[PDB]
Amino acid sequence: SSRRKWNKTGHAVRAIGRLSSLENVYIMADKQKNGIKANFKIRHNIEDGGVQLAYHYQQNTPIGDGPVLLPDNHYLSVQSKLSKDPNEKRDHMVLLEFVTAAGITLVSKGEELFTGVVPILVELDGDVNGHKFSVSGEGEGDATYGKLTLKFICTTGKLPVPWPTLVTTLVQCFSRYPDHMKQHDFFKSAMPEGYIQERTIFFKDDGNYKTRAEVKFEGDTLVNRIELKGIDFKEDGNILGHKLEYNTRDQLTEEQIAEFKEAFSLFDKDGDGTITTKELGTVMRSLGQNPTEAELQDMINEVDADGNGTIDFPEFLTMMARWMKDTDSEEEIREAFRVFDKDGNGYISAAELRHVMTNLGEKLTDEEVDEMIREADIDGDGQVNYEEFVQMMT
Ligand SMILES: [Ca+2]
Ligand SMILES: [Ca+2]
Ligand SMILES: [Ca+2]
Ligand SMILES: [Ca+2]
């Protein structure tokens, strides 16, 4: 009961945080190169706790001289699932991805090449701090659904970096663009001749990858051919030290989906199954924030898949599934803590939890409030400190 109220509020606070923290794949026109640029952040869960951030900067330019579509600003939203083939002895990764464009509220000739299932081939040669490796992948893409299925093998033996750190490098032409956004699909517009995709990926507190790729049709097959160079890595760090989780935190208990629903109904105050800017603004104010209408619209747009300007119940479930797979940074947890720690002394008092829970539209007996404290209080001091809060929101 008390653990449900912590999880309910924790989810709401984390949700508000993620809506503001730029989690999608942001695409913009690059007129100077007749192509696009993109930026985004990837969260890599560290096996023993914590997150390794990877900040991506990207640019794509057409290989051919034919006309391409230069998009208005929008983003891609990715759902990735990593697994292992039980009958594969080589170092490998199996990948299932669903990628959808959004971010623009309510067709090129190259798009015609993507109406069915298209075979994919991927080849990567890498060198990270002098540790060389090669990867070959094969599978299929079904852009109608934004669906990719690939299997990758390290053809040089043992991969000297974690597989998750190579996912973004290892075919955005398979993204699903909604009907109202077909004019913003640069990737398909450049086909069949293709594009060059370049990135720098900064692993926070560690080294960086530099990648260059040619993506194009070779016959009926969409081929991704990549060179990757990594420098400045720590031999003992999260990447060369292989300290990152592999498997996607995939499975959802019905207790978890139920917690997401309880969180949803904190926002959805009129019980109509969708969250408006008014409702989101109401919750954020009750937590001590003061967003403008433009900010509220922008926050909703980050998860508003259908572009109708509200967060629908399925859109909320989808975002919460995405967010909870990946760990918060310590800066983010400290910020969540400060929603409760209203005076800043490093301790959440009963009066402070009482204030927050009151304002969020809950009538609670002080005994209910005290047993919340009791649940988080690892050292019977009658308060919640940061170390206790960190465990309560993980
Ligand atoms: Ca509503
Ligand atoms: Ca919506
Ligand atoms: Ca305090
Ligand atoms: Ca305590």
UniProtKB/Swiss-Prot annotation:
Q: State what changing residue 25 to I does.
A: In Azurite; shifts the excitation and emission spectra to shorter wavelengths and increases quantum yields compared to BFP
One BP annotation, GO:
bioluminescence
* Entry comment on modification after translation: Contains a chromophore consisting of modified amino acid residues. Maturation of the chromophore requires nothing other than molecular oxygen.
The answer, when asked if Nuclease is one of the entry's keywords, is no
* SUPFAM superfamilies hit by this protein: GFP-like
What effect on the protein does mutating residue 171 to N have, as reported in its record?
In R10-3; matures to the red-emitting state with excitation and emission maxima at 555 and 585 nm, respectively
Its quaternary organisation is:
Monomer.
Tell me the impact of changing residue 136 to R. Answer: In mut1.28; shifts fluorescence lifetime from 3.03 to 2.76 ns. In mut2.2; shifts fluorescence lifetime from 3.03 to 1.94 ns. In mut3.3; shifts fluorescence lifetime from 3.03 to 1.88 ns
Q: In which tissues is it expressed?
A: Photocytes.
The entry's biotechnology remark is:
Green fluorescent protein has been engineered to produce a vast number of variously colored mutants, fusion proteins, and biosensors. Further generation of mutants led to more stable proteins (at 37 degrees Celsius for example) with brighter fluorescence and longer fluorescence lifetimes.
Q: What is the effect of changing residue 231 to V?
A: In EBFP2.0; shifts the excitation and emission spectra to shorter wavelengths and increases quantum yields compared to BFP
Q: Which InterPro entries match?
A: GFP, GFP-related, Green_fluorescent_prot
Q: Which cysteines are joined by disulfide bonds?
A: none
Effect after changing residue 99 to R: In Azurite; shifts the excitation and emission spectra to shorter wavelengths and increases quantum yields compared to BFP
Describe the effect of residue 183 to R.
In Azurite; shifts the excitation and emission spectra to shorter wavelengths and increases quantum yields compared to BFP
Ordered alphabetically, the record's keywords are: Chromophore, Luminescence, Photoprotein
The family note in this entry says: Belongs to the GFP family.
Protein name in the entry:
Green fluorescent protein
